[PDB]
Design an enzyme around this catalytic site. Sequence first.
Site, PDB file in Angstrom:
ATOM      1  CE  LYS A 166      84.276   7.910 -48.865  1.00 43.12           C
ATOM      2  NZ  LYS A 166      83.218   7.033 -49.433  1.00 43.12           N
ATOM      3  CG  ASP A 242      88.006   0.494 -55.552  1.00 45.87           C
ATOM      4  OD1 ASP A 242      87.929  -0.736 -55.334  1.00 45.87           O
ATOM      5  OD2 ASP A 242      87.885   1.330 -54.639  1.00 45.87           O
ATOM      6  CE  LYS A 266      86.447  -1.235 -52.432  1.00 44.14           C
ATOM      7  NZ  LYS A 266      87.446  -0.199 -52.062  1.00 44.14           N
TER       8      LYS A 266
HETATM    9 MG   LIG Z   1      87.846   3.492 -53.946  1.00 45.31          MG
END
Ligand SMILES: [Mg+2]
Lengths: 369, 369, 369, 369
Positions: A166, A242, A266
Amino acid sequence: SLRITRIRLYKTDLPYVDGSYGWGAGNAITVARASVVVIDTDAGLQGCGEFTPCGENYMIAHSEGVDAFARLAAPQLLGQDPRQVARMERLMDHLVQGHGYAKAPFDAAFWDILGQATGQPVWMLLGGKLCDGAPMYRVAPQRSEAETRAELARHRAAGYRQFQIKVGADWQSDIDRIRACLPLLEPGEKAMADANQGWRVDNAIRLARATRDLDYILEQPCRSYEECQQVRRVADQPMKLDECVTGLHMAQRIVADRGAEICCLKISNLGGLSKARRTRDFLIDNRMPVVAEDSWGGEIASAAVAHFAASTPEEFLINSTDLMNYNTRSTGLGGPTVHQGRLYASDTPGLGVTPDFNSLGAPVADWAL
Amino acid sequence: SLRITRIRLYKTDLPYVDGSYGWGAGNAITVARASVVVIDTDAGLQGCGEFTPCGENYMIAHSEGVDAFARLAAPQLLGQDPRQVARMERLMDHLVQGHGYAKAPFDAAFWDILGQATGQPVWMLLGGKLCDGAPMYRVAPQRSEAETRAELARHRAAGYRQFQIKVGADWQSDIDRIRACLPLLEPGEKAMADANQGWRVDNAIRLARATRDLDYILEQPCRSYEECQQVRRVADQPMKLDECVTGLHMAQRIVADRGAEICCLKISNLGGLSKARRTRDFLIDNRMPVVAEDSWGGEIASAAVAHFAASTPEEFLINSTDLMNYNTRSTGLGGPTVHQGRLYASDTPGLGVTPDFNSLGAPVADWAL
Amino acid sequence: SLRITRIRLYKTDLPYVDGSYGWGAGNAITVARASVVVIDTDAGLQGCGEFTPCGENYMIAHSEGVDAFARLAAPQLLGQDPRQVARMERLMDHLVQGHGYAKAPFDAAFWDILGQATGQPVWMLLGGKLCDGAPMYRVAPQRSEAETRAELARHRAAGYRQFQIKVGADWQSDIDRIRACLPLLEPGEKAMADANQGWRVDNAIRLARATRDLDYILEQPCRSYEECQQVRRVADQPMKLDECVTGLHMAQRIVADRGAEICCLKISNLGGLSKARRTRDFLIDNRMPVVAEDSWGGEIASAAVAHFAASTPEEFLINSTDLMNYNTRSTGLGGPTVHQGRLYASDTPGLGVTPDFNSLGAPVADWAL
Amino acid sequence: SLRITRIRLYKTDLPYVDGSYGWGAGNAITVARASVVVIDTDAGLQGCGEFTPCGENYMIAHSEGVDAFARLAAPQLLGQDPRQVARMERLMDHLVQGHGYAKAPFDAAFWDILGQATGQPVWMLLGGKLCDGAPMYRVAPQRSEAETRAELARHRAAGYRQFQIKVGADWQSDIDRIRACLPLLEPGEKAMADANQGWRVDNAIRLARATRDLDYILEQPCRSYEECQQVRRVADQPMKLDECVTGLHMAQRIVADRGAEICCLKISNLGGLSKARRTRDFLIDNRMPVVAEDSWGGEIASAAVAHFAASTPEEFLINSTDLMNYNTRSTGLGGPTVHQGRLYASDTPGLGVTPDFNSLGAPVADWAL
Ligand SMILES: [Mg+2]
Ligand SMILES: [Mg+2]
Ligand SMILES: [Mg+2]
Ligand SMILES: [Mg+2]
């Protein structure tokens, strides 16, 4: 023949498991607000859907936006046929343009109802079980070098072969994070450094140039697609896009440019399971690797994710995720399961999930025919 | 749990209703050769599908190719779950590359079995009833100009409000044939001039310039996409593309160029209902008007066409046609129904059609376990 | 004057010399199924041609397709003049569209007849002997370190200078295979890593990156052209395209893009020696290096390969292959020869090959005028 | 086995049959200067070729350039095998770059020898008789309304259906020529306005706009391709490109832009029959209508033209021309024939022509083995 006789909207809190969850350029998660849509029919079938963001500024999507859409749409959605998923999709799109995130939980309930009416799981109506257990990833770690090597070995023995680093808040220390992590994973393993739209374009490039000799997945370094393509001019790392993958139109453009190695899907950023399914099917036919996911959530949103991933061809599905296990609270009873590092859909009719009415409370809004 | 236990291939002749069917550069359909695939299962569910070419040189498709494919594929498909349509699609695509026309009858039979197993019609599994009775057209084949005026009176009588004028055998007389036909139609009625790849580019341009003051749909003037684009440079007429629309790759190219006003979607040319559905769904999302069809055939082919048309948004569905009514003979029992120049899908489970065993005769090949 | 008086179709099994042939993403040719076309004339000149696939899912082509094509086309080819290769080409393409592989053995038999009628070998009618012995490659070898170093030494001694590393089933170990074989070659020598459409685009990029310091020919890494171009964005290795080179249309795209360093020309994948020659001559005129091959097969297929190779300018011909030496059975009597690692065509009139009737058996089909 | 033993160059005057020949922007040809190449072999097979410009400044070609090429290349061609036309093509191209017009007579002579060695007409060696009698045009006329009617009536009755209007010297009165000629011809007929590189781009556009309602072929309005494309921005007429079509590279550009409706193919402008065949076959494969011809000349140049036309698919061959009939003197004995407005190639071995040694006179240059 079927009619929608009632629509109710539920809202609850989903605290994070550790309490602290960092993403992007210094963003903060502690409590995520869930929106659960419950649709009732005259034959006594009931479906549920869910949208929960991972931050109110993560994508073009916020938690109060579900209520506002429901207030316009729900009186117009009464008496209509819910198993006709595409007919509901076009009606919701005739009522209000855009606002896909808010239509997403309605659409998931319509797919849930279709599954129950047909006696089939949602993966079957999406084409079949093309993946027996989606591979998953671990978000680890942040800690010391000795603790990292121990925790990666605990993830390795559990069946995990993919790891997210991250990043995105400080390009200079992110370079250090990537450089220290990669010799700690073994031959067969994948590392994705997700910046979550976090870097400025010049700083993204500096990081790419500093890590040019390294094998990892460069994930959403910058906010827009154009900044990401600008980083791509220099970066040879397999690029994962993304947050910018907002629908079919962007998917068409990523394909035209061959602008990513992995597209992350998503469900609610694509505006529902119907639109998410069509975008993945398009990307698969164009032989683009995909991740099948949603932003955040409990069991209900995770049940849609599981059926989305199980119906993705195994050859092209990079990973999925267990969104419900990132929370200490629940939105539904049931949902998917995790076994030896892999995410499995339900095989019972519908989404395999019913609302956890006691966790959600009484509905905040209610439309009955 | 379900398994394919038997596959039978049937062949039969389908004579044309008005003797000769003049299409293209001088071709004709007197008798078309049907190929019917019948799939049996261990739960007693039977699915069927049909490919019939409209001329053996019409598209990259011929009747003997079905037999060839079936010999290679059918032993590999026994014992497999036919409800999982995308798994079968990928299995068939794994076994042979291309030859989509031959995979098409098998694909129709799977959507039939899945339909019966879910207790739902195919239009419901394709999304819903997005169109209640597809507006129809009738082809008026290559005959004399004094007897197509009477044929357009005969077809209007049967309730058709859209007419496909067969052209493409001679650009010179085709100019006359177009100019005579247009003032013979009333307000609200549409004409398309289908050359069926017949014209040479220079002659197609000449036709387009000679008919520039007219309103008709210019359909597939030349063979290749590129040739049709060269015509389009000069031709302001709404252009329909048909035979060259072979899949999603072409659909992408057509959308990128905004290269037509109508895209014709023939199920077998696209490689089956699974692929046809996805090219339809991609084009509708790019707001391209479509025609939902197949090449030719009896009730079985027409059943898949009707469900394809019924699940297409009525806003973007130009027309379809009743293929089963072009023949003097049958492939199926049941199938679609037409009422007042509109094509209606069945509301019964599966395709709503069973093989006409007496018309088909003994199967030409039989694979069982 | 000349007329085709008889067409016969033969089918035979060609078993691989070393049991199993591992190509692509985990495929195997244990036994290939050969299709031999035999054409007789009224002056008693006989032609023969062969199509044999290297796996039924290798390209858009299978073994039963020749039969299917012959059933439609052969009655129409009787009485026609076979020396006139472009007229026959034309005629075939008028009878069916596409299906080039199935037309390919017919086309070769026509070139055979033209050679015999003119008293010249097929290379002569293809333009002259532009290469005296085509260079060849060996598949080499998946073994020990010492056994590899010794086996490359005996192929080297025999005159071979080029080697194919068969890869494509596991990118990670494919990296290891390329890295271990390159230091075992000496420096005038060429290695080609053929993935045979095997890699997913992201993994092909990982491999290309991990071997960026190495000199080898990166061959057909992915299935589609577009994917191969995406890999080419990152990989500086000379790129060889093979199975996606399906015709002149693609060659034009490749030249326009300057999208490969070597184009592999498989006769049957191009639709026969006529279309293969024209695609060859196009690429040569645009200064593109070429390989002259076919999918698989016996002496009849190899004879077409050898003459195709012999008429390719030496300066631009990378290699060819002795397809007949990969099997334990024959399709033909005679055919080409191999001398000091080089493939030599025959210099006698026609293809230099007659059918091995004892091996082929009874014809599966026979049309007589 | 065969060897060139002797090469001779001849030069002769070909006066124009009708005095002066007005073409382009103020040019006139009264006498054209022919260059004939004669090649002898050790087996006694003799071949001949011809290049004659229609004006020294017409294309990148002049009469004296054949002499110059020959003096450099002919000693290097003695002892070579002339039947191997591609080997000879590549040797010539190795000896000098470009200057294809000068190589063209040598190339024709080699095709002649090959046809004799194989016992077949050149059209057979170019693929077959794909057109039985090439359609012809008449360059008529240029005068009064009463005299044009009588001249078009005799041409019509003689079988002619295509007419060239020679324009390009004055755009203003070229408008009037086109306007007065077009209504003087019946439904089936065609007319091409050939400006022969003559209009300036602004004047070509003024002509295009003035005649934007008329059906004719706009032939080579300006010199360069780009100038022609600029005219084409405005002009909807079928465009014919001629002198700028210098080879395959330009043919690839034309195809890529779809920048013409007809391509005119002059053998000597393409650098000889070998390159001419390759450029035509490429354009036919790209479905471009072609004209098969040459610059100017006698029976030797016209023999090559007729064989070039005869091997062109009749669907795509616009016209050809009888070059030998434009002159009052000869270069050869034999050559093609004309019947009912169609040009017919010979069916005897080779080009079907021998050098008219008596008309040609003494050889201007003589190289012997
Ligand atoms: Mg991502
Ligand atoms: Mg059509
Ligand atoms: Mg290869
Ligand atoms: Mg001209």
